[PDB]
Design a protein around this nucleic acid. Structure first.
Ligand SMILES: Nc1ccn([C@H]2C[C@H](O)[C@@H](COP(=O)(O)OP(=O)(O)OP(=O)(O)O)O2)c(=O)n1
Ligand SMILES: [Ca+2]
Ligand SMILES: [Ca+2]
Ligand SMILES: [Ca+2]
Ligand SMILES: [Ca+2]
Length: 341
DNA sequence: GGTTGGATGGTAG
DNA sequence: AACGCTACCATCCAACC
């Protein structure tokens, strides 16, 4: 098979640049303001000009302003980026019937029946890039390989505004030479566990006892890495179905006062219920982020669907459980609905 | 021993 | 050191077939 993966370039910042062209060439930082103080929050993303100086996703806005105090700091307008994304995804639908929308700015296309080889795949990749630039003036990176994982890795290698094929021979070289930390799904915790076992490359997972690898990183990740290393990973492109919808907000101050927290939680429920749009959940979880940014959650699954009124009542009980069973103050509070009918 | 549900862990967008 | 918000799959544990 052949898989073509598309990853939009510095997406949120690039959309802002398209809607206001004077931003291009100079550092733009898209921010998630919590409302705590002036400028409390995190960077969602920045364009490559700000990113050159270390302003990247996840860092505090305060750290970013220390590095580049003269950059443009824009509030995140997620709804705008979602609508642009949906338009681009609709363009991609024209090139394959088999498409997997992986996120707000990623999609996998199974183009096995559309092209005969990697040269034709590459030309299709170029066609897709030109189409998205024509219609939306958004640059993207395309990665192409035998499966979803190596397609994603290919795009990682080609980013800013690139295109890359990893053919069968390069898959073999990467199994030997790619830092296993750069494999999709291997974060810092798993990477460091692997390094302690002396595993630096995918091929190293074949030289360890399965029971030992499973003991350290778990069965799923062990099976996943071994399948990749054996050149056998072949997970199909399929339609992802949304499994949960939720909202969590930062409170104006930390609190353990039930009556102070309730209005935030209730607003999170109202917004979550609107986003449900005909979906009726059977499960509710109240999620608290404590003072030190730990996550505590209490939930319940009902035999039937949950009305909004039941969500209110139950959410209070679950919040009460969090307060009873955890003595830390709550910083952020929210809700998540799942198990849709 | 497998499935379910609840609490938590790890991950990536 | 600071510090947002969305949502996926996985693991551990105990209840229950
Ligand atoms: N911690 C993060 C990471 C990403 N995003 C959002 C903003 C990004 O623009 C978008 C896509 O994530 P990417 O990791 O692909 O980031 P970029 O597209 O901005 O950069 P890149 O050029 O590496 O693809 O998701 C976010 O809100 N919070
Ligand atoms: Ca990506
Ligand atoms: Ca991207
Ligand atoms: Ca990694
Ligand atoms: Ca139980």
């Amino acid at each position: 098979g052949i898989v073509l993966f598309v990853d939009f370039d510095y997406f949120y910042a690039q959309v802002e640049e398209v809607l206001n062209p004077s931003l291009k060439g100079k550092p733009v930082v898209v921010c998630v303001f919590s409302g705590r103080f002036e400028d409390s929050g995190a960077v969602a993303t920045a364009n490559y000009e700000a990113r050159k100086f270390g302003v990247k996703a996840g860092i505090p806005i305060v750290e970013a302003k220390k590095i580049l105090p003269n950059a443009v700091y824009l509030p995140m307008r997620k709804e705008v980026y979602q609508q642009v994304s949906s338009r681009i995804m609709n363009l991609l639908r024209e090139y394959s019937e088999k498409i997997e929308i992986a996120s707000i700015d990623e999609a996998y296309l199974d183009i096995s029946d559309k092209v005969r080889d990697y040269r034709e795949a590459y030309n299709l990749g170029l066609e897709i890039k030109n189409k998205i630039l024509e219609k939306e003036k958004i640059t993207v990176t395309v990665g192409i390989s035998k499966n979803k994982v190596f397609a994603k890795i290919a795009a990682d290698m080609a980013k800013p505004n690139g295109i890359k094929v990893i053919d069968d021979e390069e898959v073999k070289r990467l199994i030997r030479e790619l830092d296993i930390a750069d494999v999709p799904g291997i974060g810092n915790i798993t990477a460091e566990k692997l390094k302690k076992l002396g595993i630096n490359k995918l091929v190293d997972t074949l030289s360890i006892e399965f029971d030992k690898l499973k003991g350290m990183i778990g069965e799923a990740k062990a099976k996943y890495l071994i399948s990749l290393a054996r050149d056998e990973y072949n997970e199909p492109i399929r339609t992802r179905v949304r499994k949960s919808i939720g909202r969590i907000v930062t409170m104006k101050r930390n609190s353990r006062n039930l009556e102070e927290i309730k209005p935030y939680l209730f607003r999170a429920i109202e917004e979550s219920y609107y986003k449900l749009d005909k979906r009726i959940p059977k499960a509710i979880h109240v999620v608290a982020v404590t003072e030190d940014l730990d996550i505590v959650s209490r939930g319940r699954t009902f035999p039937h669907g949950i009305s909004k009124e039941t969500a209110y009542s139950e959410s209070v009980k679950l919040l009460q459980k969090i307060l009873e069973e955890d003595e830390r103050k709550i910083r952020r509070i929210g809700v998540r609905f799942s198990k849709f009918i």
